[PDB]
Ligand binder design. Structure first.
Ligand SMILES: Nc1c(C(=O)O)ccc(Cl)c1O
Ligand SMILES: Nc1c(C(=O)O)ccc(Cl)c1O
Ligand SMILES: [Fe+3]
Ligand SMILES: [Fe+3]
Ligand SMILES: [Fe+3]
Ligand SMILES: [Fe+3]
Lengths: 174, 174
């Protein structure tokens, strides 16, 4: 049987749920309990963290523009997701999704992580560039599991303290 | 490093490769050697086979319309993929993609099958409805591996012979 229901118009779906895409992630999962985690992400979002996904991530910026702050070969790079662009991110490439425009929508598809395969969430110092804090988690929901982690980083100067130059990461207002 | 390159406009990509989407599958893979097998499928295609995919399949009919002939709970059903529709197919639900219109384009995303996880390709009798022939394969390319299988079924009346009512499946002209 069609465990996930019948086909349906995606634009309309997005229009009807536009109001539910809210910060910090701007996340919204289409189907529940599937192997393919299919989501729509809108803006304005609020991310200061770099995600280290053990699996690939597929992107398709359907509406508006956004960009990904990356760490490619040890360098802070930027990959723009112009409306209409698709992109496949290899596993583990660190990325921080910046989606500043309202009414924006990006199709993001990922995979359920097998038990034992953890996702990493990191922060880097804006001063020396050194890694400030890393949290590894067995992710069960890219929708609900994210904010709580960010909250604990923002609420702790000890976590935000760079082990290289003692500079304390801005946190919530970064 | 970005093993799969930078982001790029998808519509333009589709426009520039429209001429390469040819029967019987109408297949065209976007990125090579990735875990997520991302393809675009256009028409007119030619499929008489039902695919039994051990993993989920994501669809997003970007241009034109198409439909999926299915076997849901033992019944020949039809799921229309109207332009703009997205759909997630559970593992193993038998399906036969019908894409009759030229200039059509559907984003289809699937997963690389682990070793030992085989795909099944089946044919059913238009008379009694009984299973006529099944082939299991360790799929390495949903692009190049398909036609050869279909060819061997079409070239054999023995394979096309229904084990229930001796009716011989039409084959190439079905
Ligand atoms: N790429 C993302 C995004 C995004 O692109 O906005 C949001 C949540 C998660 Cl878990 C991601 O991996
Ligand atoms: N759904 C498809 C399609 C399709 O939808 O046309 C083509 C090839 C393969 Cl291997 C598929 O699983
Ligand atoms: Fe991510
Ligand atoms: Fe520092
Ligand atoms: Fe299939
Ligand atoms: Fe028969």
């Amino acid at each position: 049987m069609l465990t996930y229901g019948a086909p349906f118009n995606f634009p309309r779906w997005i229009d009807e749920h536009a109001h539910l895409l809210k910060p910090p992630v701007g996340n919204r999962q289409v189907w529940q309990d599937s192997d393919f985690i299919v989501t729509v992400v809108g803006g304005p979002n609020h991310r200061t963290d770099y995600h280290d996904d053990p699996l690939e991530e597929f992107f398709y910026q359907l509406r508006g523009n956004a960009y990904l702050n990356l760490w490619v070969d040890g360098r802070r790079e930027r990959a723009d997701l112009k409306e209409g662009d698709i992109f496949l991110l290899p596993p583990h490439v660190r990325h921080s999704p910046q989606r500043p425009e309202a009414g924006s929508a990006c199709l993001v598809i990922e995979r359920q992580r097998p038990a034992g395969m953890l996702d990493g969430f990191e922060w880097y110092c804006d001063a020396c560039g050194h890694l400030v804090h890393r949290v590894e988690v067995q992710l069960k929901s890219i929708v609900t599991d994210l904010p709580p982690l960010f909250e604990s980083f923002y609420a702790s100067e000890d976590k935000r303290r760079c082990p290289h130059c003692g500079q304390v990461h801005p946190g919530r207002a970064a």
